[PDB]
CSV table of C-alpha atoms in Angstrom, one decimal:
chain,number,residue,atom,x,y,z
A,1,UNK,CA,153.9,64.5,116.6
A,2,UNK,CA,154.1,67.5,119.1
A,3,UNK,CA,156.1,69.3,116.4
A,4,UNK,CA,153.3,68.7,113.2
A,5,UNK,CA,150.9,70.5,111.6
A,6,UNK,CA,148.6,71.4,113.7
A,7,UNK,CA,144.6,72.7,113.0
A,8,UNK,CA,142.7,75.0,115.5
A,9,UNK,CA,140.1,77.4,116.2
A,10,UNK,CA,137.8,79.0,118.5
A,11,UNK,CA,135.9,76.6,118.0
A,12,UNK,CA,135.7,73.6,115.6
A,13,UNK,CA,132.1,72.2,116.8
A,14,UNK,CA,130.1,70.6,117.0
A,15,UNK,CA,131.9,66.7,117.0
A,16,UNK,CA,130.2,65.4,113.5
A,17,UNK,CA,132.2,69.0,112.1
A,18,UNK,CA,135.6,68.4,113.9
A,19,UNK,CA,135.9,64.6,112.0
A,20,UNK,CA,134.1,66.0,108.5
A,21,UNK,CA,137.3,68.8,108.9
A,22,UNK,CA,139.9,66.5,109.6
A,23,UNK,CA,138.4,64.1,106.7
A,24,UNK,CA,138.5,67.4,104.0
A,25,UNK,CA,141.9,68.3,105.1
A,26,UNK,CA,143.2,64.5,105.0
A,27,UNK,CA,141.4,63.7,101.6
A,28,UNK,CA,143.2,66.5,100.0
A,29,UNK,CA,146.6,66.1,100.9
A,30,UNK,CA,147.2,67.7,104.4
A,31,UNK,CA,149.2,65.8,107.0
A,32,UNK,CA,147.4,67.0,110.2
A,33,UNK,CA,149.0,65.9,113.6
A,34,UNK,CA,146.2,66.9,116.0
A,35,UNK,CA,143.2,68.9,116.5
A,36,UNK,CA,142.6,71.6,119.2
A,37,UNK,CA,139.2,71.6,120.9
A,38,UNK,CA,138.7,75.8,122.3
A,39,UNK,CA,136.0,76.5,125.4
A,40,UNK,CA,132.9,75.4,122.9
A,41,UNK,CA,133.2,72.5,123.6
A,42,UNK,CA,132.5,72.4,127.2
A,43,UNK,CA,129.0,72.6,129.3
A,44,UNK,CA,128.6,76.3,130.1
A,45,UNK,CA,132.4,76.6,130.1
A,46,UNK,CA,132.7,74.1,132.7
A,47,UNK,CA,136.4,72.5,133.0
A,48,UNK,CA,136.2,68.8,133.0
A,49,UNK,CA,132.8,68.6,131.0
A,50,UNK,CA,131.3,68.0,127.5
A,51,UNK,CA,128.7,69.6,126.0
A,52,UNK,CA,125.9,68.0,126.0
A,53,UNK,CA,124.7,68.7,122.2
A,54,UNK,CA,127.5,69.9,120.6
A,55,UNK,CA,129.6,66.8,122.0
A,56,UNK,CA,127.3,63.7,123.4
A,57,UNK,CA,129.5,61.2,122.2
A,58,UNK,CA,133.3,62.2,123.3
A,59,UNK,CA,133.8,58.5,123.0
A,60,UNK,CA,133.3,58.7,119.8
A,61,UNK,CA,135.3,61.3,118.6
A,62,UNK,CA,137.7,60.4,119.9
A,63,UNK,CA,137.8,57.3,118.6
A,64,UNK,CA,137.9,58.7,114.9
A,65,UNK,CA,140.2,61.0,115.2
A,66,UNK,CA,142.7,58.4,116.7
A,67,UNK,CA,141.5,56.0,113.8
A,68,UNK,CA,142.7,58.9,111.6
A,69,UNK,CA,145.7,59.1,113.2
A,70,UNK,CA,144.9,62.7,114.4
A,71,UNK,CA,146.2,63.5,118.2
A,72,UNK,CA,143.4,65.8,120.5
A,73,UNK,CA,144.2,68.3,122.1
A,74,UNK,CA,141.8,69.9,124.5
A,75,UNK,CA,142.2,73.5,125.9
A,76,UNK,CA,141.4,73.4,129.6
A,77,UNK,CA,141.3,76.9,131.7
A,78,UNK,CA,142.4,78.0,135.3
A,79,UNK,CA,138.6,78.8,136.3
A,80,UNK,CA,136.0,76.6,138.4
A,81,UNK,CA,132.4,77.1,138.0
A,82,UNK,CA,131.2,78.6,141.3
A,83,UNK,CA,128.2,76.0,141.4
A,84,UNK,CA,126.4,74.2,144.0
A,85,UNK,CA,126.5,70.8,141.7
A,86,UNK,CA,129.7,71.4,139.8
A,87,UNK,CA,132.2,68.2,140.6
A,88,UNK,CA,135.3,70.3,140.8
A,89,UNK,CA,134.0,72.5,143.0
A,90,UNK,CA,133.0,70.5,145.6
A,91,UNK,CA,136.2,68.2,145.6
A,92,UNK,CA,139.0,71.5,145.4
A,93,UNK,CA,137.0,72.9,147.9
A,94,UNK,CA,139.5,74.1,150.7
A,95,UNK,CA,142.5,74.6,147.6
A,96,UNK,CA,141.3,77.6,145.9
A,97,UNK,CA,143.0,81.2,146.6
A,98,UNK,CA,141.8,83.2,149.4
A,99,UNK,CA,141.5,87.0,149.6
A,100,UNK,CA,143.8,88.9,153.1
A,101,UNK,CA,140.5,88.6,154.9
A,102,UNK,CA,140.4,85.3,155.0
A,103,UNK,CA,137.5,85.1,152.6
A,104,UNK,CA,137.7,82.6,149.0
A,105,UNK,CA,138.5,85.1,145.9
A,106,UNK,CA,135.5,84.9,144.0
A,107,UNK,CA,136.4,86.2,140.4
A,108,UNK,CA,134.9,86.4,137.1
A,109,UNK,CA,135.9,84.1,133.9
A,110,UNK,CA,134.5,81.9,131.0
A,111,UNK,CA,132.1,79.6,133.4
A,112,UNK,CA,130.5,82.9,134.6
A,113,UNK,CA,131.3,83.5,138.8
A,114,UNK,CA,134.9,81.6,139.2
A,115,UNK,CA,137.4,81.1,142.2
A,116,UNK,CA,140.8,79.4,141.1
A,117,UNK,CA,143.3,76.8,142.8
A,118,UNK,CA,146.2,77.8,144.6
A,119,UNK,CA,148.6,75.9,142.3
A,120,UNK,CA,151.1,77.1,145.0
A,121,UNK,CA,150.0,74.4,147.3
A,122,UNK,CA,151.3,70.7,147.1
A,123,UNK,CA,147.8,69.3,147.9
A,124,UNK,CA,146.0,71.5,145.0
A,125,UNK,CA,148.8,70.6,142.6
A,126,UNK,CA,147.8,67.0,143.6
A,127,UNK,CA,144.3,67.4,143.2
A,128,UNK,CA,144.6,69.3,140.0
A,129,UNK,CA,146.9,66.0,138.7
A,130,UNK,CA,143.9,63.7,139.9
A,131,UNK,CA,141.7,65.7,137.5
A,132,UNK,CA,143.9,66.1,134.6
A,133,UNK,CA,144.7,62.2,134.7
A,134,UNK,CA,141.0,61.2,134.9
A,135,UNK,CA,140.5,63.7,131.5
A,136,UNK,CA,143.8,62.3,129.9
A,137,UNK,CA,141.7,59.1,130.1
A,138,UNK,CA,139.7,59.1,127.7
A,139,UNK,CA,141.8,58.8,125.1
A,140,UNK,CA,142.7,62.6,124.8
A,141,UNK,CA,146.4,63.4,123.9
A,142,UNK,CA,147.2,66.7,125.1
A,143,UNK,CA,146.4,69.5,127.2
A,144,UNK,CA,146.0,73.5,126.3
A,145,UNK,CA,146.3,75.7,129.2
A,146,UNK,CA,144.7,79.1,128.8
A,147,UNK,CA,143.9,82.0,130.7
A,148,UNK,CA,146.7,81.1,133.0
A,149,UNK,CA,148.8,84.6,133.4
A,150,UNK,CA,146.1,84.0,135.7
A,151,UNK,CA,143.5,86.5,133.9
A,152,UNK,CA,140.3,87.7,135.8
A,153,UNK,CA,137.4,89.6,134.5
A,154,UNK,CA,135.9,90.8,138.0
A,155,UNK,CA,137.6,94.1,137.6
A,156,UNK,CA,137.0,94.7,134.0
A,157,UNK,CA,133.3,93.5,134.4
A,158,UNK,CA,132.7,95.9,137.7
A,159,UNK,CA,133.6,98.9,135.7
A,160,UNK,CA,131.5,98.0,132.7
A,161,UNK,CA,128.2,97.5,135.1
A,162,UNK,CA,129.0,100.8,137.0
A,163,UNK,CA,129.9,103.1,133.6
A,164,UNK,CA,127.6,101.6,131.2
A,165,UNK,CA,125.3,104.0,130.7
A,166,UNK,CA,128.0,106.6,130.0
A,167,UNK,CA,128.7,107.2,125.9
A,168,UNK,CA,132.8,107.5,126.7
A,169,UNK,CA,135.6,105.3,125.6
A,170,UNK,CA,137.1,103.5,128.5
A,171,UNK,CA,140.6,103.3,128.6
A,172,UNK,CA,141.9,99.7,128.2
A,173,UNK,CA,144.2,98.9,131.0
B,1,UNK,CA,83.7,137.2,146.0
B,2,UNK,CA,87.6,137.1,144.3
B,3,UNK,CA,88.5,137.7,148.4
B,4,UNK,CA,86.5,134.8,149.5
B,5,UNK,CA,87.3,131.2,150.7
B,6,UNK,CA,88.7,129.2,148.0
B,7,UNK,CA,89.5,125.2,147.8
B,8,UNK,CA,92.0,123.9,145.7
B,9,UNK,CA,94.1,121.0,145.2
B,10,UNK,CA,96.6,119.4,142.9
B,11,UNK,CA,93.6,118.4,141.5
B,12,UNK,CA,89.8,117.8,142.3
B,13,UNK,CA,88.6,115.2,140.4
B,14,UNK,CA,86.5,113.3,138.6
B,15,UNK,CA,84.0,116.1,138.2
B,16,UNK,CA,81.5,114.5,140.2
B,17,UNK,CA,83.9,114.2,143.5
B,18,UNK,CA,84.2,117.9,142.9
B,19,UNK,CA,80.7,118.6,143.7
B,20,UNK,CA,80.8,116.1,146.1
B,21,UNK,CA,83.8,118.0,148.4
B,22,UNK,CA,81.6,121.2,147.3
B,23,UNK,CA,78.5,119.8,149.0
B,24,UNK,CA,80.3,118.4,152.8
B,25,UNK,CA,81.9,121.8,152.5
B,26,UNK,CA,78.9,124.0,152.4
B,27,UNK,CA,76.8,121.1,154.6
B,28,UNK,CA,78.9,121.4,157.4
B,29,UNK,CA,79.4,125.8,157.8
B,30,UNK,CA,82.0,126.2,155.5
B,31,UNK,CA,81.6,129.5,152.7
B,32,UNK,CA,83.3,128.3,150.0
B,33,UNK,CA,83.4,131.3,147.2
B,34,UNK,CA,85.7,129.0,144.3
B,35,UNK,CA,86.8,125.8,143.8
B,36,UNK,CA,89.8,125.6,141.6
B,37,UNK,CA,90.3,122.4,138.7
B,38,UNK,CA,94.3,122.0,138.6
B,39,UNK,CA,95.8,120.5,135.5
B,40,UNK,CA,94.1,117.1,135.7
B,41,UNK,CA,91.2,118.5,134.3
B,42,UNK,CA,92.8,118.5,131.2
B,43,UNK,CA,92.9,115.9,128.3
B,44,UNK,CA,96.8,115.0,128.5
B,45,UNK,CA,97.4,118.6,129.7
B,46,UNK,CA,96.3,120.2,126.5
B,47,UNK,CA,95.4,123.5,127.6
B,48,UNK,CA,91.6,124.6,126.6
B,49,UNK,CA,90.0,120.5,126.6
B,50,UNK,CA,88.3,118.6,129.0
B,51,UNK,CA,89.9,115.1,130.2
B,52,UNK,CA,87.2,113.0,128.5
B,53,UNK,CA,86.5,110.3,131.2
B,54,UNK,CA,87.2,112.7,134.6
B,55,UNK,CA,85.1,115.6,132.9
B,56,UNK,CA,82.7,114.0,130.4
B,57,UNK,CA,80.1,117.0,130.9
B,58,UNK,CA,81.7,120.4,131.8
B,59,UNK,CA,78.7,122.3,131.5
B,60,UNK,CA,76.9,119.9,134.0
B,61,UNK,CA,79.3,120.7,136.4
B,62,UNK,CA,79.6,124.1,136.1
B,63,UNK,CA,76.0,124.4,136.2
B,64,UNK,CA,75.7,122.4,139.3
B,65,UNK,CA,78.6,125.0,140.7
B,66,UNK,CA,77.2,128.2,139.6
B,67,UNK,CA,73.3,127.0,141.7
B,68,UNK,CA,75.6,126.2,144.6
B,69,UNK,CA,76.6,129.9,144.4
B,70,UNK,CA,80.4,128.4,143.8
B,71,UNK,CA,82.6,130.0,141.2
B,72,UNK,CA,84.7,128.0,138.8
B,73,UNK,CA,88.7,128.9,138.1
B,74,UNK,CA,90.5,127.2,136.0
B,75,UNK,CA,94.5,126.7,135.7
B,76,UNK,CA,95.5,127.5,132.1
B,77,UNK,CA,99.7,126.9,131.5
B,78,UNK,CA,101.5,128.2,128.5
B,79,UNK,CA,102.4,125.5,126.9
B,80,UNK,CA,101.2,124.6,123.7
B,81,UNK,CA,101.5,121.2,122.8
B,82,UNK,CA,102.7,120.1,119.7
B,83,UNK,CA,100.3,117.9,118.1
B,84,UNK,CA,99.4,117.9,114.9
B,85,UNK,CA,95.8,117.6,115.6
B,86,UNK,CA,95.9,120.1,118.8
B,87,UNK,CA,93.7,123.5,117.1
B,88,UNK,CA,95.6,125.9,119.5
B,89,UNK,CA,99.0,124.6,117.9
B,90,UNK,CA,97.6,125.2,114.5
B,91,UNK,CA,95.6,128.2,114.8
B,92,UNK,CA,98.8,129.6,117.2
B,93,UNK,CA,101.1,128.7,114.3
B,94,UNK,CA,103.0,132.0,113.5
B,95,UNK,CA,102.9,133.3,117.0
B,96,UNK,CA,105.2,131.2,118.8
B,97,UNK,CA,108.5,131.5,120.3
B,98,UNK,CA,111.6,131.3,118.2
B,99,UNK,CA,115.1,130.5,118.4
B,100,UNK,CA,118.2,133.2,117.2
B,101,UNK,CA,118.4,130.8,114.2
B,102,UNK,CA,114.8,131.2,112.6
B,103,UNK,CA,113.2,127.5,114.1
B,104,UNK,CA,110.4,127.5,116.7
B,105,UNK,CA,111.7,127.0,120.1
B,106,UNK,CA,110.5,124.0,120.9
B,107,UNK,CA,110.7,122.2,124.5
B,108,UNK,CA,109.1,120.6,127.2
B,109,UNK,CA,106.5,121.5,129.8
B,110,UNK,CA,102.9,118.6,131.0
B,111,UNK,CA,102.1,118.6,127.9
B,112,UNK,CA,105.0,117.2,126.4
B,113,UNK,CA,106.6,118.7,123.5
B,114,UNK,CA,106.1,121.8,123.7
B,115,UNK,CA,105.9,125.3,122.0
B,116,UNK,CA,105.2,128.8,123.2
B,117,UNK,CA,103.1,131.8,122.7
B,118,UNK,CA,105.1,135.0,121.9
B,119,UNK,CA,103.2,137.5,124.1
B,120,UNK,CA,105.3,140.3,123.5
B,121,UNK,CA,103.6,140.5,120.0
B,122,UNK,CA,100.3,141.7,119.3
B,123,UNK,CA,98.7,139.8,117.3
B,124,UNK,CA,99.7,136.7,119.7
B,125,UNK,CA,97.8,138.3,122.2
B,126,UNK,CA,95.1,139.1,120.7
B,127,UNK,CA,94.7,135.4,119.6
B,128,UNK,CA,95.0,134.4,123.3
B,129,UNK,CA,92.4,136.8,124.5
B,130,UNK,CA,90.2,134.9,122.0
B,131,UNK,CA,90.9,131.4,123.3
B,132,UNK,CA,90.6,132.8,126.7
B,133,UNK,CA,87.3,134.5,125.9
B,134,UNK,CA,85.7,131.5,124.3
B,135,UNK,CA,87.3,129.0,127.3
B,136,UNK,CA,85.5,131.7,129.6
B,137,UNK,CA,82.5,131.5,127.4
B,138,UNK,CA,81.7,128.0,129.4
B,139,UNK,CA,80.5,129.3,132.1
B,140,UNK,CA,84.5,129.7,133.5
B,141,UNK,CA,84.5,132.2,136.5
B,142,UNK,CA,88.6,133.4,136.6
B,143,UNK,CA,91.8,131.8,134.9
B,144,UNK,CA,94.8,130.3,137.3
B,145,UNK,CA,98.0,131.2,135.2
B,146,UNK,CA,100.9,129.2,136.4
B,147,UNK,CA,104.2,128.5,135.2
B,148,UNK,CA,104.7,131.5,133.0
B,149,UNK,CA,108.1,132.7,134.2
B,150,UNK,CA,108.3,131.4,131.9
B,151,UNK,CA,109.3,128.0,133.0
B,152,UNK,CA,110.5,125.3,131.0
B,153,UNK,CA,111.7,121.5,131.3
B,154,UNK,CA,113.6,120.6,128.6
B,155,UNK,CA,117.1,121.1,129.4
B,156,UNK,CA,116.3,119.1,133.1
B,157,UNK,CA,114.9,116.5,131.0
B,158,UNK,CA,117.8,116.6,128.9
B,159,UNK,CA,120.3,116.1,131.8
B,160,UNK,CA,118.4,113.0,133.3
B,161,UNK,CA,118.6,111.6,130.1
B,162,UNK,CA,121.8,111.8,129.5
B,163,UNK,CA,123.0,110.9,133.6
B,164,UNK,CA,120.2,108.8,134.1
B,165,UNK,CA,121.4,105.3,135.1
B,166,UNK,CA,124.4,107.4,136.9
B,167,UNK,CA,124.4,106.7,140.7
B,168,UNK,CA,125.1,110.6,141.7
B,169,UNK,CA,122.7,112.9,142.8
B,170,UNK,CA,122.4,115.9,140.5
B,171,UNK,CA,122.8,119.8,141.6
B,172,UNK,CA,119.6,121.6,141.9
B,173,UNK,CA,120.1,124.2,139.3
C-alpha cells in the first residue's frame, strides 16, 4: 500500500473534512491508499498532540479512514515545544543538543521556541522509539518526517527582527 | 529699558504664573525691565495667536504687565503653517518660498508643515511689517526673532523616518 495513490496537503483539516475527502474521492472512482495529515493538525505545532478543535476525536478518524480502507499517515517534525507543561519536554530532557558552552541549543521552528534531540545518542534514539511507538498506537500507519536536514529558523528569524524596519531585499541564503 | 534685566524661559506660562514670577521678582529687589513669552504662548505654534487655554486674555496680561512697569517681548518664528484655515498662510499666499521647479517649498519647522516667507521681495515684507504692526498693536513691547537662519527640519525629520527603528546612532549633521 506504501506504493498507492496517495492524497495530501498542507493541511486537509479539520477531521469531519479529511473523511468527507476521502468519501468524494472514493465515490467517484479513486483508489486512495492513505492520507497525509501536515502540522494543522497538531496543538500549537506540538509533536505528539491533537488539536483540540480541529481534531477532538482522533479515535474516530481513525477509525473511518481504516473502515475505508485508507492508511494515515501523520507528518511528525524534529522540534520540541520549549514549554514548561509540554510532555516531551520534560521526559527528553537531558537528550537534546547542546551548544560548545555547555548550554541546551534553543532554536526556532513550527512550535515557536524549540530545542531538538541528539538523535546521535543511543538513549535519545530510545526515547524517540518510546514516543513514536506510543503514537503508532493509535491506529496510525505511517510516519512523515519533516524538517529533518535538521532546518532552524533562529538565524533567519534574528535577522528579520533586527532589519525589519529597513525597505531592502534580503538576500536568501 | 531694551538694556535692562530681562527674564525668560522656554516658556512662562499659563499667563497667570507669568505675572505671578513677575510679582516674587519685583517683591523681593529684583528690576525686572521684560519678560519674554517663548513659543508656548502660541496656539499649536501658529505664529501671531494666542494658546486658547494658557492665554485666554492677552490683553489682561499685558495690562497687568505694562502697570508693573514690565515690558512684553514676544518670540515670533518664520514658519508659516500650512493650514487651510491659518489667515497668515492665506493672506501670505504668493509670497512664499519656492522651489527651482515652480512649487512652494514646503517643510517642517513647530508648527508642523510648514512654508516660508520670501523676505528678499518687497511686497513680502511689507505684508510682514503689517502682521508685525497689528501683533504689536496689543500692547506687544519688542519681537524675539529666532530660527531665521533660516532653519529648517524637514530633511532631519526625513532621516528618522526613514532609520528610525535602526539601532545606530546618527551623525550630527
Amino acid at each position: 500500500w506504501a506504493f498507492g495513490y496517495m492524497i495530501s496537503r498542507y493541511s486537509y483539516y479539520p477531521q469531519d473534512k479529511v473523511v468527507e475527502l476521502v468519501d468524494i474521492m472514493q465515490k467517484e472512482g479513486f483508489r486512495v491508499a492513505g492520507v497525509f495529515l501536515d502540522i494543522h493538525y497538531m496543538d500549537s505545532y506540538k509533536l505528539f498532540t491533537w488539536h483540540p478543535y480541529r481534531f477532538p476525536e482522533p479515535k474516530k478518524l481513525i477509525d473511518e479512514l481504516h473502515k475505508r480502507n485508507v492508511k494515515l499517515i501523520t507528518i511528525v517534525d524534529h522540534g520540541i515545544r520549549v514549554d514548561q507543561n509540554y510532555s516531551p519536554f520534560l521526559s527528553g530532557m537531558g537528550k537534546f543538543c547542546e551548544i560548545e558552552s555547555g548550554e541546551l541549543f534553543v532554536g526556532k521552528m513550527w512550535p515557536g521556541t524549540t530545542v531538538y534531540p541528539d538523535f546521535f545518542r543511543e538513549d535519545t534514539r530510545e526515547w524517540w522509539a518510546g514516543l513514536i511507538s506510543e503514537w503508532l498506537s493509535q491506529g496510525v500507519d505511517g510516519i512523515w518526517l519533516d524538517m529533518n536536514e535538521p532546518t532552524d529558523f533562529s538565524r533567519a528569524i534574528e535577522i528579520r527582527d533586527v532589519l525589519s524596519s529597513l525597505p531592502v531585499q534580503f538576500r536568501d541564503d
